[PDB]
Amino acid sequence: ALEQKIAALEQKCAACEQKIAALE
Amino acid sequence: AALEQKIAALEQKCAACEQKIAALEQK
Amino acid sequence: IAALEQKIAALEQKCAACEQKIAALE
């Protein structure tokens, strides 16, 4: 399913905006 | 449906993800 | 749906090494 593929990316990139912002 | 929206939200969230990581790498 | 399939593939490619590069930078 597509629902499961979206869920996997959602988990994968759960805190990357925050972590990049912290590195910055 | 719900799905299209969850996809759009991800597209927006990680819009600049890769370019900022690269800027961080370069600097 | 055919587009939704394509858009998901697009994000999987975009952020393929994303978490690994962040971890390394940290």
Side-chain angles (χ1 to χ4, degrees):
Chain A
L2 287 198
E3 311 187 327
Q4 260 131 35
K5 247 166 174 146
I6 306 152
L9 306 200
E10 274 181 356
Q11 297 151 47
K12 184 173 151 156
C13 294
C16 78
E17 277 52 57
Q18 270 156 112
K19 284 165 100 48
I20 299 165
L23 291 155
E24 291 174 339
Chain B
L3 293 193
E4 296 232 31
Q5 187 53 219
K6 279 174 151 163
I7 288 173
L10 271 163
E11 295 181 326
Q12 298 146 38
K13 193 171 144 162
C14 299
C17 200
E18 272 53 54
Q19 22 217 297
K20 274 148 137 261
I21 287 166
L24 251 18
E25 300 192 317
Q26 277 158 71
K27 304 153 193 169
Chain C
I1 287 46
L4 290 167
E5 270 200 282
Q6 167 166 29
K7 295 161 148 176
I8 300 147
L11 287 162
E12 294 182 320
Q13 285 151 78
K14 312 272 161 89
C15 299
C18 186
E19 284 47 55
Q20 280 173 46
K21 286 195 157 200
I22 288 152
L25 286 152
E26 287 177 328

